[PDB]
Design a protein around this ligand. Structure first.
Ligand SMILES: CCc1c(C)[nH]c(=O)c(N(C)CCOC)c1Cc1cccc(C)c1
Ligand SMILES: [Mn+2]
Lengths: 427, 552
């Protein structure tokens, strides 16, 4: 805007020093984009150029958010965050409503554009500095530092938090039942209305925001049903499941029971009471593998019993808000991927499976990245905090392509694995 | 002379303060030499006298070493650097020559007194203070402080190069045709003009500079194409690394061997074929940079083959953004892969190699992929885009592997190249058990202590065997156990292990390994017609494993 506001003094963690992160290499295409974006921001006064006395640096990526013709700048403040927000998880902590997950529909709408109006504490800017790369490192990176609250920064939502619960207040006034959660750049509005009623209530909010606080969310489709449209509706009341099921069949073989006693035995680690020793006794012989055999008695009392101990979830499984969430994904096949979000071995708080398309657009990567953003959101909703993904993908590869289909404004914390072996039959 | 270049505001790390490293009074003539120079620098403003009303100090040294035509001043600033704020790392990454665009004409201006021309933040001068000594023990106190960028202080290259860029910009704009690249003290100006008018721009650029107290080569030029830069031989239309001499001896220490290897890689950029999986193979298992190593046979062989290549000169061409980046990979052998990135048939932008991973079990398809990768990455950094690959693998052999690979992948676009060696599926395991095929309940175990083991099996057909093993571990036997079955099994077989390890290993369909055995358990996998490997739990998992658990 053009209205200087009282800047909220920001100080990193105790004896902590700003970020100094490597700005990964980019395509010429994206550099041109970013250059374009920034040249403009520099004009709207949002950012400025710096000198060599600014040693700090946070990474930047160019991505298209709504696949829309043009790009969006995506700053990876994952580092400036731990160095601050964790005392802005305290100092200005933003509380997580345990019921939003219960609602019938949670539409998710952007608000990041609000922040660009609150000037940033002068002596902090020096930290929001980033660099637009040079191809082949010919020229010096272009160097910019922020002047208003930066988006990727989990400290803008915390500062704005005030200006928001105000704008939103004369709306929660009326529609009280609707819960609203703010996580960084997004707003999570949840309701129980009939789809259409809800969807209308949202637009009812869209314009409230828009008109009152000039904030500016966005319109899903542009008044047109091309049969390739959406609006980002989540239906939390819809999730919980047990994809872990022993196969029910008529005739079993050695190799069939074998692979069964296998998993079943493994399952034991996650599920408390599960004994298999009599069903397995049916295997103590050096019988061929194709040879069919029928189920014994004390054995038949196991498949039957254990099939049922596979409907009643673990016990000691509670959410420790001191520890953080870990998410493990495994390539399942034909565009199918299973996943767990545990906090300590075998104490999963949730397991589901992504699968959106296998033959046409299906790309091992584009799948995973989307799978990741899905698994995230779920947790941002369920627990109001993103997990730490253990991606079954080669580091260099993922580092090259995630930005290709990453549409979200936030960026989780990932790490790459060796090889889920038997944990693949978690299918 | 000094400039009207506004300075970069500097600070000393938090809490910290100016350095007070007192001077060790020393040597009359050299104790005048400085004063001889100081009063000369001071004249030109580079420095200035100061009372001891305020500051600290730093060690001033007089040092002559050349063919002795004059002595030179020096000031260790370390106890200052240790107190100065961090700056923006100058040379993050050097531009690779393979991605520069040819310029008809190119000149190199040698900005000289650079540093002493850029000014120094007024309030950070007080720290650059130093003092040249008395005739002997009677301090008169010749005190001065720096007004320019002192000769070895942290914030110097940064603030220098920072100031240059600012100075260039008007010019760089009044002439959007002259590409200037500043590296340290040098300025390389390239363009596509008639050598006549290209000389003009240089002089203009040259005169521009001079108006900001900066000076340049008055022999009107100082260009010696090709340029010796960062270990490259830079011509105006090609590039290489001339001084690439790998000497020989009859004594090779961890030291000389490394040094040889290093020099060898560096050449990989453009010298098609270089290898090193042998001369390095040696290294692991030591950290004695003076210990003599026996130049093994392959090492002697490979080193030769590198000489054959290197003996004959090879060049590198430049980048034309007008065409397409093609990069192609060929397999060499011992987990070795080479490649080159061309836009033209007989030209090359760059060449390179790819060495395998873990000291263990990998795979030809997987590797070929890690390669397409290595390159996709490289390419992005140099040319800013990914190249069009051409590779020795058919859409089938490939798609089959990832489809079966538990790990995600994404190979950009590629075209088949029927040039061997070829990357293929040397075998595949059956997915369902084989009806008819004898079933082998294999197993093993060894004494962690005694290192003595057993490897055997028991078939449904009631066939048994137990073979003794020496110098072995639980794992090596469990594999030997399989190798065994495969060995005694007929063209079609079903093997059954209790070792998650042996399973997994084989499952990865490795084509090669550094475990003589696995190469054996492969050699046979390949021979076999249809093989099925199945996993069952160790002890409670005593399926058909009832008999094989302790008889073995
Ligand atoms: C290698 C020679 C060269 C070519 C072919 N093309 C250029 O544009 C150029 N410069 C004017 C601009 C370089 O910009 C990044 C140089 C000089 C140079 C000298 C030493 C090192 C390099 C990388 C380039
Ligand atoms: Mn065993």
């Amino acid at each position: 805007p053009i209205s200087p506001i009282e800047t909220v003094p920001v100080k990193l963690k105790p004896g902590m020093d700003g970020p100094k992160v490597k700005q990964w290499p980019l395509t010429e295409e994206k550099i041109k984009a970013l250059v374009e974006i920034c040249t403009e921001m520099e004009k709207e006064g949002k950012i400025s150029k710096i000198g060599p006395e600014n040693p700090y640096n946070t990474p930047v990526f160019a991505i298209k958010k709504k696949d829309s013709t043009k790009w969006r700048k995506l700053v990876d403040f994952r580092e400036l965050n731990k160095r601050t927000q964790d005392f802005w998880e305290v100092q200005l902590g933003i509380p997580h409503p345990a019921g939003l997950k219960k609602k019938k529909s949670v539409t998710v709408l952007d608000v990041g554009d609000a922040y660009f109006s609150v000037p940033l504490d002068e002596d902090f800017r020096k930290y929001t500095a980033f660099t637009i790369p040079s191809i082949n490192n010919e020229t010096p990176g272009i160097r910019y530092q922020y002047n208003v609250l930066p988006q990727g920064w989990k400290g803008s939502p915390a500062i704005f938090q005030s200006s928001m619960t105000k704008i939103l207040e004369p709306f929660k006034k009326q529609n009280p039942d609707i819960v609203i959660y703010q996580y960084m750049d997004d707003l999570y509005v949840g309701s129980d209305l009939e789809i259409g009623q809800h969807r209308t209530k949202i637009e009812e909010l869209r314009q409230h925001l828009l008109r009152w606080g000039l904030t500016t969310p966005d319109k899903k489709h542009q008044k047109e049903p091309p049969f390739l449209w959406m609006g980002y509706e989540l239906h939390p009341d819809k999730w919980t499941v047990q994809p872990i099921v022993l196969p029910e069949k008529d005739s079993w073989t050695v190799n069939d029971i074998q692979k069964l006693v296998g998993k079943l035995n493994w399952a034991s680690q996650i599920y408390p009471g599960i004994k298999v020793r009599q069903l397995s006794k049916l295997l103590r012989g050096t019988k061929a593998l194709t040879e069919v055999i029928p189920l014994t008695e004390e054995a038949e009392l196991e498949l039957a019993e254990n099939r049922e101990i596979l409907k009643e979830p673990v016990h000691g499984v509670y959410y420790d808000p001191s520890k953080d969430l870990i998410a493990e994904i495994q390539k399942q096949g034909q565009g199918q991927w299973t996943y767990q979000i545990y906090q300590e071995p075998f104490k999963n708080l949730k397991t589901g499976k992504y699968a959106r398309m296998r033959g046409a657009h299906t790309n091992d990567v584009k799948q995973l990245t989307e799978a990741v953003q899905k698994i995230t959101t779920e947790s941002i909703v369920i627990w109001g905090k993103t997990p730490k993904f253990k991606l079954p993908i080669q580091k260099e590869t993922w580092e090259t392509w995630w930005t290709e289909y990453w549409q979200a404004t936030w960026i989780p914390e990932w790490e790459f694995v060796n090889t889920p072996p038997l944990v693949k039959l978690w299918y | 002379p000094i400039s009207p270049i506004e300075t970069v505001p500097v600070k000393l790390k938090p809490g910290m303060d100016g350095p007070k490293v007192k001077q060790w009074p020393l040597t009359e003539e050299k104790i005048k030499a400085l004063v001889e120079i100081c009063t000369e620098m001071e004249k030109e403003g580079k420095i200035s006298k100061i009372g001891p009303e305020n500051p600290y100090n730093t060690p001033v040294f007089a040092i002559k070493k050349k063919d002795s035509t004059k002595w030179r001043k020096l000031v260790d600033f370390r106890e200052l650097n240790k107190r100065t704020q961090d700056f923006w790392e100058v040379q993050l990454g050097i531009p690779h020559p393979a991605g520069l665009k040819k310029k008809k004409s190119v000149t190199v201006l040698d900005v000289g007194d650079a540093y002493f021309s850029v000014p120094l933040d007024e309030d950070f001068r007080k720290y650059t203070a130093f003092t040249i000594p008395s005739i002997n023990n009677e301090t008169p106190g010749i005190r001065y402080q720096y007004n320019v960028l002192p000769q070895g202080w942290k914030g110097s290259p940064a603030i220098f190069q920072s100031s240059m860029t600012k100075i260039l910009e008007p010019f760089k704009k009044q002439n959007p045709d002259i590409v200037i690249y500043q590296y340290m003290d040098d300025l390389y100006v390239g363009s596509d003009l008639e050598i006549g008018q290209h000389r003009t721009k240089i002089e203009e650029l040259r005169q521009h500079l001079l108006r900001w107290g900066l000076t340049t080569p008055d022999k009107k030029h100082q260009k010696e194409p090709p340029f010796l830069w960062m270990g490259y031989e830079l011509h105006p239309d090609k590039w290489t690394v001339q001084p690439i001499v790998l000497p020989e001896k009859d004594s090779w220490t961890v030291n000389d061997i490394q040094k040889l290897v290093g020099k060898l890689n560096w050449a990989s950029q453009i010298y098609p074929g270089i290898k090193v999986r042998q001369l390095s193979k040696l290294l692991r298992g030591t950290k004695a940079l003076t210990e003599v190593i026996p130049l093994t046979e392959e090492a002697e062989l490979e080193l030769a083959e590198n000489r054959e290549i290197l003996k004959e000169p090879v060049h590198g061409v430049y980048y034309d953004p007008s065409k397409d980046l093609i990069a192609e990979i060929q397999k060499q052998g011992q987990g070795q892969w080479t490649y080159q990135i061309y836009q033209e048939p007989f030209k090359n932008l760059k060449t390179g190699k790819y060495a395998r991973m873990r000291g263990a079990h990998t795979n030809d398809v997987k590797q070929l992929t890690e390669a397409v990768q290595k390159i996709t990455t490289e390419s992005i950094v140099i040319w800013g885009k990914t190249p069009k690959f051409k590779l020795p693998i058919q859409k089938e052999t490939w798609e089959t592997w990832w489809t079966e690979y538990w790990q995600a992948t994404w190979i950009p676009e590629w075209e088949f190249v029927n040039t061997p060696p070829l990357v293929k599926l040397w075998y595949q395991l059956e997915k369902e058990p084989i009806v008819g095929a004898e079933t082998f309940y294999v197993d093993g175990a060894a004494n962690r202590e005694t290192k003595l083991g057993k490897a055997g099996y028991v078939t449904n057909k009631g066939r048994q065997k137990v073979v003794p093993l020496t110098n072995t571990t639980n794992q090596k036997t469990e594999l030997q156990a399989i190798y065994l079955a495969l060995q005694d099994s007929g063209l079609e077989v079903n093997i059954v292990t209790d070792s998650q390890y042996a399973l997994g290993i084989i499952q990865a369909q490795p084509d090669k390994s550094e475990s003589e055995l696995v190469n054996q358990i492969i050699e046979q996998l390949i021979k076999k017609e249809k093989v099925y490997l199945a996993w069952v739990p160790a002890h409670k998992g005593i399926g058909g494993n009832e008999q094989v658990d302790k008889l073995v």
